[PDB]
Amino acid sequence: QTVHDVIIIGSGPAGYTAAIYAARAQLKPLVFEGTQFGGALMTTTEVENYPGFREGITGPELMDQMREQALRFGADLRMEDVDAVQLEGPVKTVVVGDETHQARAVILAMGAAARHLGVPGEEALTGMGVSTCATCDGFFFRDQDIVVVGGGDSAMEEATFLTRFARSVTLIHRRDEFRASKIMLERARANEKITFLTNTEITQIEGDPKVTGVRLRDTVTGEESKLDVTGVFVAIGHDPRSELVRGQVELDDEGYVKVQGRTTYTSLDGVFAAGDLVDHTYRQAITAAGSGCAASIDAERWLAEQ
Amino acid sequence: QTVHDVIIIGSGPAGYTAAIYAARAQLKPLVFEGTQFGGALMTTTEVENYPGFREGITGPELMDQMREQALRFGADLRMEDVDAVQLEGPVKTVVVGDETHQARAVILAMGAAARHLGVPGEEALTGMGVSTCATCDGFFFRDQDIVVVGGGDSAMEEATFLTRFARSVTLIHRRDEFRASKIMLERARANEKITFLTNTEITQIEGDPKVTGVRLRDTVTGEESKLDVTGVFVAIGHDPRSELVRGQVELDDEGYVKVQGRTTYTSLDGVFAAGDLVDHTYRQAITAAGSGCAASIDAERWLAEQ
Numbered sequence A, B: 001q002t003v004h005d006v007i008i009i010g011s012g013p014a015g016y017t018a019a020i021y022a023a024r025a026q027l028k029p030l031v032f033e034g035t036q037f038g039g040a041l042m043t044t045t046e047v048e049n050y051p052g053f054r055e056g057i058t059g060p061e062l063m064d065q066m067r068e069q070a071l072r073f074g075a076d077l078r079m080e081d082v083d084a085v086q087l088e089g090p091v092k093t094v095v096v097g098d099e100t101h102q103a104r105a106v107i108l109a110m111g112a113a114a115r116h117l118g119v120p121g122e123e124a125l126t127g128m129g130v131s132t133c134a135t136c137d138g139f140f141f142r143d144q145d146i147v148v149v150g151g152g153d154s155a156m157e158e159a160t161f162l163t164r165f166a167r168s169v170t171l172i173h174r175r176d177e178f179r180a181s182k183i184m185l186e187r188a189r190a191n192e193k194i195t196f197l198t199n200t201e202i203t204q205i206e207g208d209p210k211v212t213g214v215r216l217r218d219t220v221t222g223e224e225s226k227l228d229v230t231g232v233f234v235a236i237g238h239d240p241r242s243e244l245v246r247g248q249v250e251l252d253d254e255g256y257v258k259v260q261g262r263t264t265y266t267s268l269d270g271v272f273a274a275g276d277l278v279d280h281t282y283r284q285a286i287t288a289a290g291s292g293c294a295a296s297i298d299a300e301r302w303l304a305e306q
Ligand SMILES: Cc1cc2nc3c(=O)[nH]c(=O)nc-3n(C[C@H](O)[C@H](O)[C@H](O)COP(=O)(O)OP(=O)(O)OC[C@H]3O[C@@H](n4cnc5c(N)ncnc54)[C@H](O)[C@@H]3O)c2cc1C
Pocket: A009, A010, A011, A012, A013, A014, A015, A032, A033, A034, A035, A036, A037, A038, A039, A040, A041, A043, A044, A046, A047, A048, A049, A050, A080, A081, A082, A083, A109, A110, A111, A112, A113, A114, A126, A127, A131, A132, A133, A136, A137, A241, A244, A274, A275, A276, A277, A283, A284, A285, A286, A288
């Protein structure tokens, strides 16, 4: 029966920053963090490019600060997943298991999942040699031999950036055709630090504390080999977590939530969106934090208009 | 004779975050911080809504972290103002006194100045009762009697937000006409917590450690009075620091630098813009930091295309 001012869905930097602003604005935000709360930084180690930390901070340490900061101003945080939403109209409903909650405004901050290879070693060595983010982690592989997996613009983009650091980048793709644009594909072939390895997949990532090599398989002949490398960058795409809102909020062709102009307004009145659910360009904690603030200010001012 | 990869102009959150990203990307950024370096947070006390600090941090402490973080990754920081720029073409030039520096890309991060009343007490009590940012500081005035100065949408917006906290908001304006939109003006007159005081100006802000009152003058009759209040919010407009780039980069009618779509690209190739020089909506440190990251990623990827 209680209709809250605002419900926030998600607990990465965008969700917590939206919650900090909404709570400090006395909106008493109700935040569904998920059971895998804390966003993508919970799965990494050192975060060095989030401004405000001259010697860096671990991913979980930073997310713990954000969560405690949200609590300090009165956010109501629940470590539960939203299973369904009704976002159309003056009163929006979220369903969590068999419980329901309602609000005048909803901030969507569910993020985007990086796709994974699904091979042994990939998850255990994430943050210790395996990464999905060259902007985040490429700096840690100066003068090392690394691999990049994928066939699209993402892989070309990641592989290009990594050559700023690595001694060599071996770009592996499971076919001999590339989904990447002609411009992106042509540039990497010109980059002398990049070696292409087509018709190839990783079957296992080796290493007892850190990545020491990968096991390879030829997707056509089945020939197997080993490659000594100390880094693996997985760039086979992203899946924005928009499944909840498909059919109610306009998405682009790749599933990202569309927003109006430079604002966080979605196609639905009273519904705002932030973070990597929206941004398919930068995908950083600081940009997600910024947009979560913007969504909270948009929502507060929209609520004051009602 | 040396042409740098990138020059950054400004040292608020946008500039330092751009410098952190560019330095960590091995672009060896050259940053002109200004003689009044560190941006708007140098002039405030406690910053509580920048995510990552569960008990807050002072403005200067936070900016010191950002500056040291930029240095850690190799940024070249100079506490000097850029006096003129030549931004058109493949090689851009900045002039600093009688010295010149050149770069393939330029990130503009000069911020926006809040306009001040220019009366005794205003600067000394900034951060101790005087503020230009309701989103930043309104939380500190719960159940207090405060004033807001100004006649436009900014003053209506600030005064509206402040009623979430204050016991009373007295909106003071030097005329009996208002430059604010009919909708904004009509809503505040409906807000029972707002009292309008037209044809009135502040001549002095009183208080030996914190704001304790203001001296008033009637702009028509000259009648003077005293008003006991513990907060003064100045909302008489902003001046984006775009003077350097007027005539080379497209600006909107209020002087903000225009950017393309959701990117940081300006109207000039190789020139990107971040922070409150661009954003005339949110004006927070976290949003400025986010856009400074975005400008640095845009610039890095644009540089790789050349
Ligand atoms: C391994 C790794 C390392 C990284 N390192 C860095 C780095 O060093 N620097 C940097 O700036 N960036 C880094 N990033 C990127 C950064 O973490 C992300 O860009 C950022 O966290 C995006 O924030 P977000 O809030 O939009 O989404 P997310 O971080 O993805 O958080 C969304 C959260 O909401 C939850 N959620 C989703 N759906 C629901 C639902 N239905 N109900 C409830 N909760 C839900 C999710 O479980 C998740 O906890 C890294 C990413 C990865 C994967």
